[PDB]
């Protein structure tokens, strides 16, 4: 099937400054027919539901303030975030929603150091 | 029969899905029918037997009622010898790779009863604007 | 309504005269042997033997075998494919060297001459190091002498390194149908007194010609298609004498044809994958190549030619018939192939004959030469190999390729030289009843109705 | 104007047969017109020179009113200069060979004659909706 | 929008007017689309990339409402936020060449809704049939 | 034109056992667009008006009861009985309906040896 | 003691060019329009009968 992988494991930074997140993918996602790309990146806390943050691999959702970006077409998709936040430090995700299975990432934990 | 839903719905992916869930997702089969020192002869003979199969069923329609609209009705009866089953018993239960087994033989007796059809249509359509 | 309005059809039957290039095609037993034995085998399309026709009914359409096209078409196709299965054959270009030539062992005739020579040479062997001496037999016509002792060489070691024919491939002829592409069609004439020029009353529309075997023959066209009831003299103007006239005839007319020796294909190795297949011995007897026709038929044949042939020339004409009057070996001497031998076979018995307005055989000799120059070609010849036994092959005389002399001062006679000349000539007779037109859809006629809108 | 008969009907099979009876059989002509180590240059540019062909004519009828029709109507009349003949004696008396000729001066005045009445009918539909 | 002049008309000719009277001569880039030992392979894979081309926007076409109208209507309404401009400064201000590229952010959006209005509007005749 | 030959001239056997008989074309006659074929096999009785067997190359008439079967495509045809009786041994015919001019059989006289 | 090369009774031995090499890169086989391809994702598949994915 379709192998959704994250690049780091963990990422524990200070508060203030950015970050960057990478998942790759070991098929294509981009859809040649709509011209637009089939990503789900997901925000989970502790002991909570997720939810979205960026639909069609680059926009925002609707509640999320500006300091997100989804980037990056093709196979390899890059969530850089411009301010870190107290209310931002969980779990991230990446999903592929292109095919049947829906696999996700493997959730790269985002701390403070 | 459609609704919200964000996967791809691409090509073939209702191929065994039931022939009356299928039949909402036709364009998309229809839009990837068509465009996808020696070895330049193969490429070009294959894309030039696509245009062809798709010029001859683009004609094998516009000789019916149908010429663009991709699903088209028409005036010849279902002969129930044909395949003698339930209306309910095809579009909720059956697959059109299990419905193209069942009347591939009765096929080619259809295909000239709907040009009959079209041509005496097209006649008393004639007719119908000359007497006027 | 006398007001009447226009309207477009699609689908109209109605054709204008087109050239286009039609597609070969083999039947299926045809298609069946592989790996090149014969030309082209893969590359043509298989269909059926007698390709499908239906006849049209009340049309009329003028044809022209003479300013036709697709003869030209075969013709180029034939010669191209001629010349592509000669690519992966053998050059002899270590063959052209100095051939030491002595005579056949044999009873020699002073007053005859032997049509064989004896030549030694040395040939290169598959080390570049070492060579070799070995001998061959050739023919008077293969080999010249160079200017004691007596040493020759080859006629074609100053135009060309002569290709060999080779050996795996055949050139026994198998029927082609040369089969139109979409849109356009090909119409036969079914008209009985036909004569290639004019309206034909009765055509029929086919996808693919009849069955065409490729006979390469100058004179005295063989395996070709019989004439219906009667012969048939066919010109494109009678009174033009530099124009042939194709004489198809009924009944055909059985010849044999037969080279007599027993000869010993030998190999040589010229060098790595290089082989030259030469003449050994002579097993046996050293005899004459020739032909036999019957001798009561072709007078019967004769007969009926200038019974037919009195209809252009008035009752009271004296047709008499000899010999060419000069040229090369293949345009004076009837040439064919018997199995991958190119006979040259003396006609001088055939056209002996004079015509008033009131259990034998023709012997006729033959010639065989091993080295060709098929369609007088700048630098292409082609070396053919000897080939085992004694070869025997039986044909039908199908038709005449004739010419008229320059009738002047007061002829009282008209003569009938026989002359192969260009090839087309043998292509026209079989394509004279088939043209190809383009249909074209979309007529336009006025009808008594507005559409509604 | 057709009947039972079991015979063939095949491609142009009635192209001697008066234009008023060649015109029961044009689906036949429509149907046989399209699907039919060098030579494959020669077989290819063949196979590409039908389905041009093929778009060329289905190009002329679809800038007119009928794409799918196969026979169709239009309301440009027909000027008697071109043909100056009976109504009675074109369709019960020649054929499509023989009609050919006889218009084939005023072939290309027609056709423009039709792209024009078919633009004007597609504007005048244009405005139609656009006052609505 | 047409008068009487006896200028050629031709090809690209109106590419600098304004898009109401470029829309006046749209047949002539319609027609001008289609017809026009080695090299016979890269001509013939020119020939065979023009008829792919034609072939997939007459397939653009025909999946909509509209199969050889070759100016159509249809029922998804004008989105405001897509173009944001007067309707009395398009048809008599710009040319093709300038709104080609104010909406080329856009297109792609547009194609999926005339597909879907068109999916819609199929299976709404369906039914309308259906129900009689 | 076309030619329809029957292989055999005749065939006298005894009653009760099943026979066949055959018909070649000169010419192919399934036809590629309708992919069904055009043989009329016909009976003729002595004196008697004929009337058909087999049409389409393999359906029999009404009033025909199920021990004939006509046979093969493309261009060779088989007529093969099942089952002899006296009310069938007279003449039996081939017939091309796919041009015209139309042409028959020979015609195979099949009586009781 | 003179030997000879084992193929010159059969062949010119064409050169390997060492320009060219010859290690493996990965052909992809695509199918053309109106085609498709399709795969197995069966684990116990051995190639003969039905795949049920
Ligand atoms: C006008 O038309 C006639 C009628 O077809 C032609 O006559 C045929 O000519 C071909 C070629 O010249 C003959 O084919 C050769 O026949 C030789 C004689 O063997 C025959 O008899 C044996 C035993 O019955 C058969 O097994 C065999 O198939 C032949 O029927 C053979 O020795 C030849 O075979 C050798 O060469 C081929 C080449 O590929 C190999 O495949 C074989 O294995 C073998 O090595 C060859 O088959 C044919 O026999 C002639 N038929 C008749 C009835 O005479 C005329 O040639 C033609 N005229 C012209 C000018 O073309
Ligand atoms: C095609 O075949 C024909 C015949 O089948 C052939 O014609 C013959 O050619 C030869 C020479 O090429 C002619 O000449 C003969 O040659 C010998 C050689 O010594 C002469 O002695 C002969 O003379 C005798 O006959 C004379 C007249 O009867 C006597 O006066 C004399 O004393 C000798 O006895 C003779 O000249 C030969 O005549 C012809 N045959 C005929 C019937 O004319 C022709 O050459 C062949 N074609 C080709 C291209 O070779
Ligand atoms: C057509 O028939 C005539 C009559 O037979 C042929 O004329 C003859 O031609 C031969 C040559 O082939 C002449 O032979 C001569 O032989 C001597 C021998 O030394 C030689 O020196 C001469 O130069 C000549 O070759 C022969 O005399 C001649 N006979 C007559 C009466 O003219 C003619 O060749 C035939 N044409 C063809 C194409 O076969
Ligand atoms: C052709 O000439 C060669 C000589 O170059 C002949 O071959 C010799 O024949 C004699 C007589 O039997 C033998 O003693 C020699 O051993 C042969 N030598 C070789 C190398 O074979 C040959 O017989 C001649 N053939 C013909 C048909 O004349
Ligand atoms: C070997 O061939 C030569 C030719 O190269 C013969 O020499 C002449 O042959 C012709 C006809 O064969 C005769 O008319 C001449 O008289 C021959 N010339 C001489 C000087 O006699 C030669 O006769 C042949 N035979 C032998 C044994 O050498
Ligand atoms: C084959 O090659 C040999 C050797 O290269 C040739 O024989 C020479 O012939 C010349 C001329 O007569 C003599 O001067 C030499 O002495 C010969 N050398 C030898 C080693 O014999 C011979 O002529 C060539 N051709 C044939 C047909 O044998
Ligand atoms: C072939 O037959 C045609 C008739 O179908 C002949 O053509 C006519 O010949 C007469 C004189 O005999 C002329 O008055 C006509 O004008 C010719 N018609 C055409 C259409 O050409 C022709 O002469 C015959 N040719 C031969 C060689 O016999
Ligand atoms: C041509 O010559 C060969 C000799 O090479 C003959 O073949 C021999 O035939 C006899 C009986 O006919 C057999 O006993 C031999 O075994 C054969 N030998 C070989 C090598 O095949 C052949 O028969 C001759 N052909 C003719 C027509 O006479
Ligand atoms: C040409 O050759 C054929 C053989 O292929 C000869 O036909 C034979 O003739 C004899 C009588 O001479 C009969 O006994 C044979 O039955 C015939 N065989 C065949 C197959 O027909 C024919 O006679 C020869 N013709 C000439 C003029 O030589
Ligand atoms: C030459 O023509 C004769 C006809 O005159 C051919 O003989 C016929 O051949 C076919 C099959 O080849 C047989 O079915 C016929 O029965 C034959 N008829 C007669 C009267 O013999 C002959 O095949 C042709 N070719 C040769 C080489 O003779
Ligand atoms: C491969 O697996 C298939 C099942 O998917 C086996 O095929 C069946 O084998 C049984 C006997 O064990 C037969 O009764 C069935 O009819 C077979 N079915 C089919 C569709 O072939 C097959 O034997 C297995 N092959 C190997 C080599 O293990
Ligand atoms: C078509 O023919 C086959 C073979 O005779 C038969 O098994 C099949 O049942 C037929 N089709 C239908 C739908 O009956
Ligand atoms: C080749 O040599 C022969 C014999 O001397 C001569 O007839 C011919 O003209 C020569 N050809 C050329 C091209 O020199
Ligand atoms: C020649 O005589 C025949 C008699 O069989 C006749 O039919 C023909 O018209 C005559 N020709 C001439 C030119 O007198
Ligand atoms: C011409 O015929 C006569 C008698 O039939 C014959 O003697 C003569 O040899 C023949 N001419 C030729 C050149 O063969
Ligand atoms: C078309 O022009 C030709 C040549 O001037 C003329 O002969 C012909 O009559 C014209 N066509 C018609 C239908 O008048
Ligand atoms: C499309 O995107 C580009 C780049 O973001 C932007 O500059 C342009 O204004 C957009 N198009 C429209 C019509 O706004
Ligand atoms: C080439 O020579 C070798 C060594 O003698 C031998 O085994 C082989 O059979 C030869 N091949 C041929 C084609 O002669």
Redo the contacts with the bound molecule.
């Keep these: 099937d379709i192998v959704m992988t994250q690049s780091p494991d963990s990422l524990a930074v200070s508060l203030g400054e950015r970050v960057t997140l990478n998942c790759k993918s070991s098929q294509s996602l981009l859809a040649s027919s709509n011209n637009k790309n089939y990503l789900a990146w997901y925000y989970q806390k502790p002991g909570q539901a997720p939810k979205l943050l960026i639909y069609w691999a680059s926009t925002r959702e609707s509640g999320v303030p500006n300091r997100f970006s989804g980037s990056g077409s093709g196979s390899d998709f890059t969530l850089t975030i411009s301010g870190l936040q107290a209310e931002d430090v969980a779990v991230y995700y990446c999903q592929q929603y292109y095919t049947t299975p829906l696999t996700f990432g493997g959730g790269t934990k985002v701390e403070i150091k | 029969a459609v609704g919200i839903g964000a996967v791809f719905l691409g090509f073939l992916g209702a191929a065994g899905s039931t022939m009356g869930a299928a039949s909402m997702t036709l364009t998309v089969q229809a839009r990837n029918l068509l465009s996808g020192t020696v070895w330049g002869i193969k490429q070009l003979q294959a894309r030039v037997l696509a245009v062809e199969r798709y010029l001859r069923d683009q004609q094998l329609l516009g000789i019916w009622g149908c010429s663009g609209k991709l699903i088209c009705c028409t005036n010849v009866p279902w002969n129930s010898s044909w395949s003698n089953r339930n209306l309910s018993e095809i579009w909720d239960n059956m697959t059109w790779l299990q419905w193209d087994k069942e009347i591939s033989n009765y096929t080619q007796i259809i295909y000239g009863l709907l040009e009959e059809s079209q041509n005496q249509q097209e006649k008393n359509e004639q007719d119908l604007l000359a007497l006027d | 309504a006398e007001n009447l309005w226009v309207t477009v059809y699609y689908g109209v039957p109605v054709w204008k005269d087109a050239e286009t290039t039609l597609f070969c095609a083999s039947d299926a037993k045809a298609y069946e042997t592989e790996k090149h034995n014969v030309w082209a085998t893969h590359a043509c399309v298989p269909t059926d033997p007698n390709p499908q026709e239906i006849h049209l009914e009340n049309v009329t359409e003028e044809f022209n075998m003479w300013k036709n096209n697709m003869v030209e078409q075969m013709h180029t196709d034939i010669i191209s494919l001629w010349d592509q299965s000669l690519k992966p054959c053998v050059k002899l270009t270590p063959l052209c060297v100095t051939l030491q030539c002595t005579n056949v062992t044999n009873n020699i005739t002073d007053?005859m001459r032997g049509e064989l020579k004896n030549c030694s040479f040395n040939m290169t062997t598959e080390l570049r190091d070492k060579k070799q001496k070995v001998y061959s037999l050739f023919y008077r016509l293969d080999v010249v002498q160079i200017n004691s002792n007596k040493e020759y060489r080859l006629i074609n070691c100053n135009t060309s390194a002569c290709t060999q024919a080779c050996p795996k491939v055949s050139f026994e002829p198998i029927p082609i149908h040369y089969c139109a592409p979409a849109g356009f069609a090909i119409l036969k004439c079914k008209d009985k007194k036909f004569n290639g020029t004019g309206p034909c009353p009765s055509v029929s529309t086919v996808q693919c010609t009849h069955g065409i075997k490729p006979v390469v023959s100058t004179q005295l066209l063989l395996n070709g298609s019989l004439a219906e009831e009667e012969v048939m003299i066919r010109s494109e103007n009678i009174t033009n004498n530099a124009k042939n006239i194709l004489v198809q005839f009924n009944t055909p007319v059985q010849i044999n044809c037969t080279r007599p020796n027993n000869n010993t294909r030998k190999s040589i190795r010229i060098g790595p994958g290089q082989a030259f297949y030469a003449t050994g011995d002579i097993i046996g007897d050293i005899r004459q190549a020739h032909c036999n026709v019957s001798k009561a038929t072709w007078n019967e044949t004769l007969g009926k030619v200038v019974k037919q042939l009195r209809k252009h020339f008035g009752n009271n004409t004296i047709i008499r018939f000899a010999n060419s009057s000069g040229g090369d070996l293949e345009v004076?001497?009837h040439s064919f192939n018997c199995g991958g031998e190119f006979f040259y076979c003396?006609t001088?018995?055939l056209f002996n004959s004079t015509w008033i307005s009131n259990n034998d055989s023709i012997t006729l000799?033959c010639r065989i030469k091993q080295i060709i120059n098929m369609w007088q070609r700048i630098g292409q010849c082609m070396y053919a190999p000897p080939i085992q036994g004694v070869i025997r092959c039986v044909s039908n005389i199908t038709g005449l390729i004739l010419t008229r002399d320059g009738g002047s001062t007061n002829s009282t006679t008209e003569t009938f030289r026989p002359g192969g000349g260009d090839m087309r000539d043998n292509w026209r007779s079989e394509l004279y009843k088939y043209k190809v037109v383009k249909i074209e859809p979309l007529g336009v006629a006025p009808t008594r109705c507005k559409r509604r809108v």
């Design positions: 007053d004076t001497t003396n001088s018995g000799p």
